[PDB]
Enzyme design. Structure first.
Site, PDB file in Angstrom:
ATOM      1  N   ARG A 127      36.529  34.125  34.824  1.00 32.33           N
ATOM      2  CA  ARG A 127      35.992  34.236  36.072  1.00 32.33           C
ATOM      3  C   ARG A 127      35.665  35.760  36.487  1.00 32.33           C
ATOM      4  NH1 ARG A 127      35.275  30.432  39.829  1.00 32.33           N
ATOM      5  NH2 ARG A 127      33.330  30.592  40.997  1.00 32.33           N
ATOM      6  N   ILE A 128      37.200  36.311  36.333  1.00 35.63           N
ATOM      7  CA  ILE A 128      36.916  37.734  36.926  1.00 35.63           C
ATOM      8  C   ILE A 128      35.882  38.630  36.212  1.00 35.63           C
ATOM      9  CG2 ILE A 128      38.094  39.881  37.579  1.00 35.63           C
ATOM     10  CD1 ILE A 128      38.423  37.543  39.298  1.00 35.63           C
ATOM     11  N   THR A 157      42.414  44.515  36.111  1.00 29.90           N
ATOM     12  CA  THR A 157      42.103  43.847  37.451  1.00 29.90           C
ATOM     13  C   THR A 157      42.903  42.674  37.665  1.00 29.90           C
ATOM     14  OG1 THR A 157      41.081  42.046  35.927  1.00 29.90           O
ATOM     15  CG2 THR A 157      39.705  44.108  36.515  1.00 29.90           C
ATOM     16  N   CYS A 187      43.445  39.725  44.495  1.00 29.43           N
ATOM     17  CA  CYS A 187      42.407  39.583  45.492  1.00 29.43           C
ATOM     18  C   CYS A 187      43.284  39.318  47.131  1.00 29.43           C
ATOM     19  CB  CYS A 187      41.814  38.242  45.239  1.00 29.43           C
ATOM     20  SG  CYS A 187      42.884  36.897  44.799  1.00 29.43           S
ATOM     21  N   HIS A 190      45.090  28.915  50.667  1.00 31.80           N
ATOM     22  CA  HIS A 190      44.720  29.270  49.360  1.00 31.80           C
ATOM     23  C   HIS A 190      43.852  28.310  48.608  1.00 31.80           C
ATOM     24  CE1 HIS A 190      45.232  31.446  45.182  1.00 31.80           C
ATOM     25  NE2 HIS A 190      44.891  32.468  46.030  1.00 31.80           N
ATOM     26  N   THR A 207      40.958  27.916  42.577  1.00 29.59           N
ATOM     27  CA  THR A 207      40.383  28.936  41.490  1.00 29.59           C
ATOM     28  C   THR A 207      41.344  30.209  41.312  1.00 29.59           C
ATOM     29  OG1 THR A 207      38.115  28.198  41.683  1.00 29.59           O
ATOM     30  CG2 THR A 207      38.485  30.648  41.160  1.00 29.59           C
ATOM     31  N   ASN A 214      37.768  34.292  46.795  1.00 36.70           N
ATOM     32  CA  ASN A 214      38.957  34.688  45.676  1.00 36.70           C
ATOM     33  C   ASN A 214      38.496  35.665  44.614  1.00 36.70           C
ATOM     34  OD1 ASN A 214      39.858  31.869  47.106  1.00 36.70           O
ATOM     35  ND2 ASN A 214      41.779  33.083  46.277  1.00 36.70           N
TER      36      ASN A 214
HETATM   37  C1  LIG Z   1      42.651  36.643  43.288  1.00 34.51           C
HETATM   38  C2  LIG Z   1      42.462  34.950  42.746  1.00 34.51           C
HETATM   39  C3  LIG Z   1      43.575  34.345  42.993  1.00 34.51           C
HETATM   40  O1  LIG Z   1      43.686  33.936  44.052  1.00 34.51           O
HETATM   41  N1  LIG Z   1      44.804  33.913  42.108  1.00 34.51           N
HETATM   42  C4  LIG Z   1      45.910  33.239  42.679  1.00 34.51           C
HETATM   43  C5  LIG Z   1      46.759  33.640  43.168  1.00 34.51           C
HETATM   44  C6  LIG Z   1      47.893  32.919  43.608  1.00 34.51           C
HETATM   45  C7  LIG Z   1      47.921  31.563  43.147  1.00 34.51           C
HETATM   46 CL1  LIG Z   1      49.351  30.534  43.745  1.00 34.51          CL
HETATM   47  C8  LIG Z   1      47.217  30.921  42.597  1.00 34.51           C
HETATM   48  C9  LIG Z   1      45.813  31.880  41.992  1.00 34.51           C
HETATM   49  C10 LIG Z   1      43.283  37.216  41.983  1.00 34.51           C
HETATM   50  O2  LIG Z   1      43.782  38.364  42.156  1.00 34.51           O
HETATM   51  O3  LIG Z   1      42.818  36.935  40.590  1.00 34.51           O
HETATM   52  C11 LIG Z   1      43.104  37.985  39.737  1.00 34.51           C
HETATM   53  C12 LIG Z   1      44.593  37.387  39.032  1.00 34.51           C
END
Ligand SMILES: *[C@H](CC(=O)Nc1ccc(Cl)cc1)C(=O)OCC
Length: 323
Positions: free
Chosen positions: A10-11, A119, A149, A176, A179, A305
């Site tokens: 996705r990213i 990223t 994120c 949260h 995804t 997110n």
């Molecule tokens: C942001 C996407 C995101 O929220 N991932 C996530 C964080 C915490 C948990 Cl418990 C599940 C999923 C992000 O930084 O994605 C890049 C890794």
């Protein structure tokens, strides 16, 4: 600026959507050993929450093709094997989450990229959050991380609040979305009907990009089965007495000025899906917040997110290149 993306998750896909639209960024290549070109084109075209790509997507044996732009595709498990130097790639964007340290992302420089943007948070590569500490970046740094994120949502807000009223201490909750389990028992339970408590390292990560806040923030998360928009709930003790009206004015001023495009502001009766596709890192919900006393307040901020974070990735890529 000529870029290549490693990883078509996705990213990687949203970064490509955003970078294709960036006038001074050119997407040259994509690498992912686990997918085929037809599956790549399909996943790029269709997105359950960010809609069909507004443009023509196709593929051939060597490319993904978007609105006539041919993007070369590779399937190398080892990034050191990629023709970045041959392709004159300026920045390698690694979205795999597995080459996220200085020694591993080094493979892209070995392959011939001039710089790497990771990223994902890194334990060894310096972390940069746009609007927070990007002026600390110096052009001799060849490998950098864009943090997470949730960090990108919390840090610009925490900087605004700390600069104006001082943050003595803060406890954070993030509601949260799914995804993005022997190691995490709660997270192995079904998402569908459940509120699932989780730990999160975002409040500590802020200490790495805002060192003045080191040790002053912690928190946790409640995971819920909603669209991929999340919301931070920051309960902070302030150094200086203030009113909520003044908090609103300071945040709005930062959103309209120095943090434009990174920190957003709304007073509308929004819900999470109103921020699908929002390119801000953090959208302050002025109506959802609540102050109890002059130094004790609950601040609420939204974030898509994937999309705000991916926009910041391209922002960092451009910043690191102009240097
Ligand atoms: C942001 C996407 C995101 O929220 N991932 C996530 C964080 C915490 C948990 Cl418990 C599940 C999923 C992000 O930084 O994605 C890049 C890794």
């Amino acid at each position: 600026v000529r870029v290549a993306i490693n990883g078509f998750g996705r990213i990687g896909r949203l970064v490509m959507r955003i970078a294709l639209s960036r006038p001074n960024v050119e997407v040259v290549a994509l690498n992912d050993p686990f997918i085929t070109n037809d599956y790549a084109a399909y996943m790029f075209k269709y997105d359950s929450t960010h809609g069909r790509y507004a443009g023509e997507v196709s593929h051939d044996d060597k490319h993904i093709i978007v609105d006539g732009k041919k993007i070369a595709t590779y399937q190398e498990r080892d990034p050191a094997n990629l023709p970045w130097g041959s392709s004159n790639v300026d920045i390698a964007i690694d979205s795999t989450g597995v080459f996220k340290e200085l020694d591993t992302a080094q493979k892209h420089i070995d392959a011939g990229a001039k710089k790497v943007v990771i990223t994902a948070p890194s334990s060894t590569a310096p972390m940069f959050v746009m609007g927070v500490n990007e002026e600390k970046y110096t052009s001799d740094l060849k490998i950098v991380s864009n943090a997470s994120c949730t960090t990108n949502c919390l840090a610009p807000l925490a900087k605004v609040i700390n600069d104006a009223f001082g943050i003595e201490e803060g406890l954070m909750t993030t509601v949260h979305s799914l995804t993005a389990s022997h190691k995490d028992w709660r997270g192995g339970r079904t998402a569908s009907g459940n509120i699932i408590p989780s730990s999160t390292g975002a409040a500590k990560a802020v200490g790495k990009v805002l060192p003045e806040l080191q040790g002053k923030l912690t928190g946790m998360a409640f995971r819920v089965p909603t669209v991929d928009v999340s919301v931070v709930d920051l309960t902070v003790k302030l150094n200086k007495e203030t009113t909520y009206d003044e908090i609103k004015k300071v945040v709005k001023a930062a959103a309209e000025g120095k943090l434009k495009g990174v920190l957003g502001y709304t007073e509308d009766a929004v819900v999470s899906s109103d921020f699908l596709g929002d390119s801000h890192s953090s959208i302050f919900d002025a109506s959802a917040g609540i102050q109890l006393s002059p130094k004790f307040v609950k601040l609420v901020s939204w974030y898509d997110n994937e999309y705000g974070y991916s926009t910041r990735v391209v922002d960092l890529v451009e910043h690191v290149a102009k240097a």
